[PDB]
Design a protein around this ligand. Structure first.
Ligand SMILES: [Mg+2]
Length: 386
RNA sequence: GAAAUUGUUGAAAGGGAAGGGCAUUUGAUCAGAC
RNA sequence: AUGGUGAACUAUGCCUGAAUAGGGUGAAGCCAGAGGAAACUCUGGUGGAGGCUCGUAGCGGUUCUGACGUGCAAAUCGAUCGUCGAAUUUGGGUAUAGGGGCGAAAGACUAAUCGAACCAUCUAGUAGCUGGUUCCUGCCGAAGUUUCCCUCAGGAUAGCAGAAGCUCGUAUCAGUUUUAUGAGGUAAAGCGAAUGAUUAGAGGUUCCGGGGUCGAAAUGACCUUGACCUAUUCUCAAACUUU
RNA sequence: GCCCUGAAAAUGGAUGGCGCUCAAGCGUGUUACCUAUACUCUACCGUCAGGGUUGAUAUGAUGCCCUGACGAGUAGGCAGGCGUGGAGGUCAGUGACGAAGCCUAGACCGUAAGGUCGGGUCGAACGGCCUCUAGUGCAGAUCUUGGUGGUAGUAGCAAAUAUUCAAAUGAGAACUUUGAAGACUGAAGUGGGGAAAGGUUCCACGUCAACAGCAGUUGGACGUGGGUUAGUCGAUCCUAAGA
RNA sequence: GUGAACAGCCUCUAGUUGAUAGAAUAAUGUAGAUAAGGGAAGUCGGCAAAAUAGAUCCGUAACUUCGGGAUAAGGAUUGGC
RNA sequence: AGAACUGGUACGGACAAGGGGAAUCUGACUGUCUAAUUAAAACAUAGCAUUGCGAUGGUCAGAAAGUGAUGUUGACGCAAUGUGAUUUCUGCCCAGUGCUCUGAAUGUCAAAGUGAAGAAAUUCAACCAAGCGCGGGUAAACGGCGGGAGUAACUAUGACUCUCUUAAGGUAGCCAAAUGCCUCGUCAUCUAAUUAGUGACGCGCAUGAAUGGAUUAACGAGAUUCCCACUGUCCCUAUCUACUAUCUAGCGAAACCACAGCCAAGGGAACGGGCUUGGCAGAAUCAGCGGGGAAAGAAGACCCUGUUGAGCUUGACUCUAGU
RNA sequence: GAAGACAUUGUCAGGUGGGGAGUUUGGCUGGGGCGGCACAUCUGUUAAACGAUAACGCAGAUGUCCUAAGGGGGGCUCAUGGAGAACAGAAAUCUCCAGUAGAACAAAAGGGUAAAAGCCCCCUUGAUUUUGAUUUUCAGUGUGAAUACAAACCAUGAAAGUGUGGCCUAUCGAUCCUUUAGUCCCUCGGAAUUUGAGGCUAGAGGUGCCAGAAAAGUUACCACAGGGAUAACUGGCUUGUGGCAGUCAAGCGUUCAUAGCGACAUUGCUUUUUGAUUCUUCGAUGUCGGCUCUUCCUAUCAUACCGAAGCAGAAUUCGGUAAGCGUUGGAUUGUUCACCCACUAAUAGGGAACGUGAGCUGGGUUUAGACCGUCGUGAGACAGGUUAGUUUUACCCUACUGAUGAAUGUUACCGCAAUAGUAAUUGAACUUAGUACGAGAGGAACAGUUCAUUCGGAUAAUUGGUUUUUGCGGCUGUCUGAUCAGGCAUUGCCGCGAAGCUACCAUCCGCUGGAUUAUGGCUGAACGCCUCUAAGUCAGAAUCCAUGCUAGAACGCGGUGAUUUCUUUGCUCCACACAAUAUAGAUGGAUACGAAUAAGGCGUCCUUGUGGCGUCGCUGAACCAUAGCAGGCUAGCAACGGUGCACUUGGCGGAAAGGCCUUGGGUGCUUGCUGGCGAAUUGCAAUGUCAUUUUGCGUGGGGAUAAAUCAUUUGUAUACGACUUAGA
């Protein structure tokens, strides 16, 4: 017999299975479509989630109640030092999908990048690209052939970059390596662009520009094993239920004499890879720029880092991207920032966002002051002071 | 000093049972006859 | 059915013991005072009654239909709860014994056993009902049908089957055809044939159907309706039929 | 005539499936080819039937031989055989130079029941044949008694607030002893005595195979012993309900 | 000792420190709890839980077998010195 | 008992410790019972009422007895019943089934005893105890309280009158009550909305007087309705603690088990793990889970059958203790 | 003292006697009960032309009736119609004609019957006596009925003859007992007589459950052996009924059959009603409802796009593609159902063992307690009402959710993408616009903007919740002599309280291309016209497939880095040296345009094309290769070609290129032609061994000198594994 009353099902069936991701760095499964008319540019970037903070800005949209009037807003800061270009890969178009024809690497690789190729770095002769470096030191013999291989073939060209994880306060010491597809033109000069950028850093301002919609790709915060009530949002069973109430009462009919794949059940929650879209960049901060957190309306010399530092992350001495809202992943997590895959006017994505005030109060409590100078003025002199 | 049941060694087979029948290949072993 | 054993659990009586904070309320009896046309009424003390009451120990066992539910436990555990000075609680002694006890009465309890305890014997109690019923090969090979039965899940009986054969040796034979001779009432057919049913008009007769017209009426006449008769017409029958 | 509309049901799915469009569909016709335990021939087995052959030697005349036909089977009937315990007869049978039993993807016979042999183990009895006799053959009866698995190194060993440090002993210490620290019962006690009941559980010494669902050097365990002193405390006497 | 109290809580005498332990802190359980705004809409049903609660002062209805109802209902106070 | 002062308005500071109100049904109350699914409206109870009996007795026990209980008793008692405090009331019916009384009896009637016939066994006849039958009493015995006809000046109805069955015809009260089918009865009230609730209306299938009727303060771990307060019951969930579950050392079971364990459809004992046609199909596994294994727990307690029972009842059949 | 031969005591007899005892309280049967009798029977039919033949199949009948309605005989002819007669008519009685039964013969019906079998008159008991045979049913038993006889005694009639009950087919009863008639016989057993009794043959009393016990209920306190031979769930066959849908078109609709409806008929579908049945299940598949959750169907309520109107607008009605997406909060009731209140775009219908009880609950139903009404004498009964009433077990397999993991030389990093899944949804306000339209009333829509509902995925800056941060403070009781500082009160209590977790109770985000359905069109035949259709084709829906999003096949794949010698000489590549290993199956060559097939291939020519001319196919049965000891050893001739082999020059090919072409020289052979030598004996065939897979051990010649795991450690992770970090 039918349900006596209707209700939408709990949870989304397109995000199945709710298993753990295969890696801590979510993979980019689609890059922006290429038109061979623009200059050569990276389409993505690698950064670390620093934390949340609060922004005040003047909303500008006609027809709204809050037009030309203040709105307090929530943003998240992603810490983005420049990425070092080491290597390039060509992809031939085959009837069985794209396939990497060959990889050409740079002559010199730092320590922090070659640590990626090791499980035990403290036990090593460290033997990394030692015989590959001998491919260089010739005039024009070796490297140019595989480079010309990517010229003659490989309709898709991607660039291997590694993050400067030593500049961030993270205690990892082991960089993150990824392919970022080049979406310039004339794949021959895509290969040329990667050639003279070997061992050279690409800053975030050359990829993302302020007031842009970008994509955040990261692995979500994990919560271990979860009951069905929280994992799927099912209704809680009544109080006087024998043998538990954080369950699903009927997990199937008599026929088919099986449990279907679509019935909510207990298991892993979180640590999924997600691609959230349409996040607007509110600031492209400069690492070597005092008063990162300042604004034309504030004009007070203060960096983006709140008093006491970003909770569980540290400080933002490097460049950063301030993007509106919330993104998948927790603090200290590697996050990939991707360009929008389509063009949207939307009367909301073309708005020019000009900040007015950035919150720098402590996130380690009910923060009261924005700067140590502000705290000293309000309170006065203390007994600690001499 | 049996069987169920068990250990060790040896041999063989095993993609959601195993076991069986006809026929033969292959491997192991063997009687007769000269 | 016979003969025994149990009131160490529990039921009720009797005998002899034993146990039961601290509060609330404030009955009779008693003292003093006040108002008083008397009569009498009122007030404050005192006192400490009640199968009274809140609530411990105790005795109990309402709800969570909680825990447990191959338990700690063949009835327990937690919380909540009833009663708590007596128709109270309880020990020991003793009385009551199975168609019998005891019962503030639930068919309750009478040793985890009760709408008739337990033990042994009669007793291998009876069952048209359930289950099982042990080696091989060869040859043959059924029935669910008849009649009777308090007969319908059973028997008896005939039949179907096997075995032993017996007397004879191709015949007093045959789940067949032919010839000759009978019997039958089904299929079909039939209703201008009996019975019954059933459509339509045509022609006739009323001293004797009902009506309208000319008539006082006529066994007077005219038009119509009903039956009646004749020759037709359409359609039928398991309990209709010549064939 | 074919095709289409008419033509709506619940897990995904059924010309058997793939798939097939002058078909690999439908109607129709003509040949070729495939294959049943069916039909023809042959061999072999048994059963039934009809016959031949005592003649001397050689023993089964219930024997040997010739001919023909036939063979499914539940319940059931009949017949011929295999095996077991024991008894009469006989093989002047086998055997401590190894009987019986047990084990053996080694050999042989029989359609089969079964029979025989070889090898290992073992240690004292046992068979062939003709007969006699029966407590004579198992896969099952929620069969009886005994034994053993998968489950499975699994459920579990979570009520009662709580342990820690060090030394001693020992093969071995979370658990024994001692010290120290931290706690609890909180006087209707986790204290000190008894009644009923138990019977040595009391105490010492030695001691850990078993029991204390971990452990164990410890124990209400195990082995060996010691220990209960009345004129006054009880019984002993009286009587009660009763016997 | 607190306190009306052989209540509940703490301590003295006396006696125990007995119940397999160790490591982590997933889901779901058992037991104990707290929740913004709403306040029975939940459910057969307020089942469960919550609220009230000691004492002192004030005040106390219908009805009544005149004994009760009654701690009715409803207010105030509460430490230390 | 009172007064100052004092504090982050706190102070029965932990512990301890009534939620309250308006109503309906029902039992008066306290008390008792189904040990181990029912604590109740059940039982008890006081009070009320009835019945039997003066001892050669009532009631009861016993195989029997020179036997017993009440009884060491004596109607202000003993035995047997019904109802169930108080208040109020307990209406009509003795035809029936009972029970109980007169016996004034051509009714019936045993054994014995008597008479006649007989040759006797025997047959016949009259007579005849208790009992039945006949005739009275009794309902706080068991119980019952129905039709019909004619009538009042609008109809309707019947204060009045008569009549059968079979004796009487339901009075005082109470009711969609725990007793009403129809029924979710109709009206009012309560709600935004009520098959609930309360108050009313009645030819009431089938209310009703110690089968007790009605009312009723107090009480109730009894059934029900609503209001205030209060809250995680809920909107709609979230978080925390202990012990588990989890991993380890030691110790270490049970249920159950034809063989086993992937589906779809088909056909099939009409719902397959196995069969057919398909889809498929990769070792070894861990924590969860409750779809399935028509999972497990019991030779269905329901139904039916059986010439199988038992407990109980009675104008069943056949007997019997006692009297 | 009382009583007194009465009580009492003993035996026999009558009444009373559920206090007690034992027992019984039919059968068939579309389950049982109620009902009925299909139980003993009879007629017609079913019944299918001998006989037989079932059903609780159809129309009925019997437990009797008759001294004549039995037996014999004689005479007459019936029902009815027509015509006539005083009262007298449709029915009185009388006359004639007609009249095959259309009457009667007890009853039920069917046969039969006309000088009778009918109606009237006469006589009588043949409805008698004796035992046998036979038919029916059948067992060739009994019982009943009957048939024809034999031996007596009669009736009637002139006589022939008829008469052994009823014109035929129903109309009935064993054993034991009692009783009667007959025989007046046998026996009473030590011998007699007489009563009495027992025997012998024929009747009567009766069993209707009728081949034949002597028999009341109840059980909700219950028991046993069984039954799925038999009911109450599901499921299966069926579909009357329920529900849904068609065809026809008399009519309604002012007018007008079909805008919307639609009578009388009729044809279907479904299994969400209820029936009918009894196949499975009674050594048990847990029978209401709700809650929870998933999925499926379409007969579509809303949302998308459309067609038709009795569509001016608005609102609405009919219909199509469509199940992508939604379909609620409540009062009462256990309720399913129902009925109201209210919101909403809408509050559609259903299935999944009437889904879902080792998921819950337990309000209802349906054990045992209890009350009432009604019924019963009673025990008790009631699909009447009411109140209280134990809801057990997963640790196994599979499924599902998550999680590891051997083996693909090792190890590490970066990737591809087969397959599977998928997602967004709906409303409001402003403007368009008081506009279009309409006499007026009234009154839209596309485009645009701002928000909101339902859903989903994350996240913690802020706000709120949570407190063992037992972090700070405060307070009570007690304990530590007081102070300070602490313990205990199972987290003592209270206020605040960071971090983490977390709330539509907080915030953010949720994409655009193609192909289509219905539908509306273009060109254009069929059908000289016309037509959206046939060929061809355009636009088009919340639809499908893509983009995008999640996982990554643990037996799908690519690129890249490093690859161990003093673990006692290890690893890799190259040449041969010998072994082992195995074969989804060499035995001359897998021999390369593309495109069309109502058209092409090749050759040639020009003015280079969609060109002209010529030729070819009609199968690869082709082309190439192919002679020599399983293919030997030598000689010459002719040309300077052919082939194999190791080197070498230069290119081309990345879809899995791993192969193709080419320059130069050397070398072997050459069957292009002509000579010389050898073969035997494997005995007359025996595959008669000539291929390539992998691995190992040796040489000699180059090439290069790593990691991973455990353990420790971090928390961006976590049940354990696993993950992510760090450590010379
Ligand atoms: Mg005066």
């Amino acid at each position: 017999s039918h349900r006596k009353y209707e209700a939408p099902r709990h949870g989304h069936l397109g995000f199945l299975p709710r298993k753990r991701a295969a890696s801590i760095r979510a993979r980019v499964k689609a890059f922006p479509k290429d038109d061979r008319s623009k200059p050569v540019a990276l389409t993505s970037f690698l950064g670390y989630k620093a934390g949340m903070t609060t922004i005040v800005r003047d909303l500008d949209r006609p027809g709204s109640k809050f037009h030309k009037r203040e709105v307090v807003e929530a943003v998240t800061v992603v810490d983005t030092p420049p990425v070092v270009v080491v290597g390039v890969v060509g992809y031939v178009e085959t009837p069985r999908g794209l396939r990497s024809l060959t990889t050409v690497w740079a002559e010199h690789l730092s320590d922090e990048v070659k640590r990626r190729f090791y499980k035990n770095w403290y036990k090593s002769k460290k033997k990394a690209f030692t015989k590959y470096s001998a491919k260089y030191a010739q005039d024009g013999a070796g490297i140019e052939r595989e480079l010309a291989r990517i010229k003659k073939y490989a309709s898709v060209v991607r660039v291997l970059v590694h993050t400067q994880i030593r500049k961030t306060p993270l205690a990892q010491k082991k960089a993150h390596l990824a392919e970022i597809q080049l979406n310039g033109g004339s794949i021959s000069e895509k290969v040329d662009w990667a050639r003279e950028h070997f061992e050279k850093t690409v800053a975030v301002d050359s990829v993302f520009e302020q007031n842009e919609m970008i994509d955040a790709i990261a692995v979500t915060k994990g919560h271990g094993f979860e009951g069905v009530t929280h994992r799927w949002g099912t209704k809680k069973l009544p109080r006087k239920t024998h043998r538990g109430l954080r369950k699903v009462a009927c997990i199937g009919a008599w026929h088919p004499a099986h449990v279907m794949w679509s019935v909510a059940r207990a298991g892993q929650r979180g640590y999924h890879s997600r691609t959230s879209i349409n996040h607007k960049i509110y600031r492209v901060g400069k690492g070597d720029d005092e008063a990162n957190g300042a604004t034309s309306f504030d004009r007070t010399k203060k960096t983006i880092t709140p008093m006491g530092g970003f909770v569980h992350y540290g400080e933002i001495k490097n460049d950063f991207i301030m993007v509106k809202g919330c993104i998948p992943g927790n603090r200290k997590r590697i996050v990939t920032l991707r360009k929008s895959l389509y063009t949207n006017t939307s009367r909301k994505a073309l708005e020019e966002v000009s900040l007015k005030w950035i919150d720098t109060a402590s996130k380690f409590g009910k923060g009261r002051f924005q700067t140590p100078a502000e705290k000293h003025a309000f309170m006065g002199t203390l007994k600690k002071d001499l």
